Amino acid sequence: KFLGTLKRSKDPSGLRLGFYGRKADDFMARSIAMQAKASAAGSGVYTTQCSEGASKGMAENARTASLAKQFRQAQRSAREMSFDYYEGRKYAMKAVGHICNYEEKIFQQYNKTAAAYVMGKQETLLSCDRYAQPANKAEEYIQKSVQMQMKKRSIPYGVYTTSCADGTVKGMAENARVAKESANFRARQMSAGAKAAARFNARRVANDWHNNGCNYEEKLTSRFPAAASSVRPTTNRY
């Protein structure tokens, strides 16, 4: 029984919910970033916080390092888009805290909204390794060895698997290189009232989302909170 419209092994992505749901997925994803950028330039001033380029040739190619990354995370195979659809229902449900029923049914249906609330709240709370900084050499080498085991997701077998390709054209890597060392100089101080909005919620990202137990590494964020937000255990495969 066949010869109609049903395939025997086609290539979906899973996650599909019809044609009338991806418009409601992407518009409510864009409403998350409408509310997430209400705290960077929410006063009415683009701060020292955004900084889309450093020089003349560093602005307009930071767009092409953002929609090629939209295309690099669109040609994923049938496992790894089945993977994070079930992981957006786990990780981003640990972002609201109060399990409320209205934003229960939305976040476990609309996975682009689920992959933007966990990414929006990690830039409102300045808790990436683009905003963090050490003070000790003991704080230093613990922080960069969690970043060394964060590359085990990208190369898990001895091949790089193209999801940290960081550049398509023959000089895009060294334009992607100097923007990183400028962004730790752009997020070098951020305020005088910063390094406590960049430090105290760094002990409110790890210890309540991921490690519900394991009181030794809960007590190491109290020692060194630089590795507490450079951990990135949200599975973005990077």
Partner 1 sequence: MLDAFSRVVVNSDAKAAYVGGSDLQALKSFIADGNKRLDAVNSIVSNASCMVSDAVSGMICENPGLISPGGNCYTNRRMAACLRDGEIILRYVSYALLAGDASVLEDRCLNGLKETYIALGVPTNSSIRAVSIMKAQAVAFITNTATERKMSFAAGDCTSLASEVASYFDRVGAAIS
Partner 2 sequence: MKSVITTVVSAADAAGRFPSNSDLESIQGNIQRSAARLEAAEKLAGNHEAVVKEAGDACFAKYAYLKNPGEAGENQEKINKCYRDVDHYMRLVNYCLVVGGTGPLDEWGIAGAREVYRTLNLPTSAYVASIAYTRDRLCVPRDMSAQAGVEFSAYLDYLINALS
Ligand X SMILES: *[C@@H](C)[C@H]1/C(=C/C2=NC(=C\c3[nH]c(C[C@H]4NC(=O)C(/C=C/[C@H](Cc5c(/C=C6N=C(/C=C7\NC(=O)[C@H](C)[C@H]7CC)C(C)=C\6CCC(=O)O)[nH]c(C[C@H]6NC(=O)C(C=C)=C6C)c5C)C(=O)O)=C4C)c(C)c3CCC(=O)O)/C(CCC(=O)O)=C2C)NC(=O)[C@@H]1C
Ligand Y SMILES: *[C@@H](C)C1=C(C)C(=O)N[C@H]1Cc1[nH]c(/C=C2\N=C(C[C@H]3NC(=O)C(CC)=C3C)C(C)=C2CCC(=O)O)c(CCC(=O)O)c1C
Q: Which is nearer to ligand X, 92 or 231 (CB)?
A: 92
Q: Which of 54, 58, 81, 146 binds ligand PEB (CB under 6 A)?
A: 146
What does the alpha-carbon distance between residue 121 and residue 26 come to, in Å, rounded to a whole number?
18
What does the alpha-carbon distance between residue 62 and residue 69 come to, in Å, rounded to a whole number?
11
Please list every residue from 134 through 163 that binds partner 1, using CB under 8 A. 136-138, 140-142, 148, 159, 162
Breaks in the chain, after residue numbers (C to N greater than 2.5 Å): none
Measured from the CB of residue 77, what is the shortest distance to partner 2 in angstroms?
A: 14
Measured from the CB of residue 102, what is the shortest distance to partner 1 in angstroms?
A: 32
Among ligand Y, ligand PEB, partner 2, none, the one that 122 touches (CB under a kind-dependent 5 to 8 A) is ligand PEB
Q: Which of 14, 21, 35, 41 binds ligand Y (CB under 6 A)?
A: 41
Please list every residue from 1 through 30 that binds ligand X, using CB under 6 A. 28
Tokens 């079930």 belong to residue: 86
Q: Which stretch binds ligand PEB (CB under 6 A): 1-9, 14-22, 37-45, 72-80?
A: 37-45
What does the alpha-carbon distance between residue 218 and residue 198 come to, in Å, rounded to a whole number?
18
From residue 54 to residue 83, the character string flagging contacts with partner 2 as x (rule: CB under 8 A) and all else as - is: xxxxxxxx----------------------
The contact set with partner 1 (CB under 8 A) reads 64, 71, 74-75, 77, 136-138, 140-142, 148, 159, 162, 168-170, 216, 223
The contact set with ligand PEB (CB under 6 A) reads 36-37, 39-40, 49-52, 62, 119, 122-124, 128, 130, 141-142, 145-146, 148-149, 152, 183, 206, 211, 213-214, 216-217, 220, 227, 231-234, 236
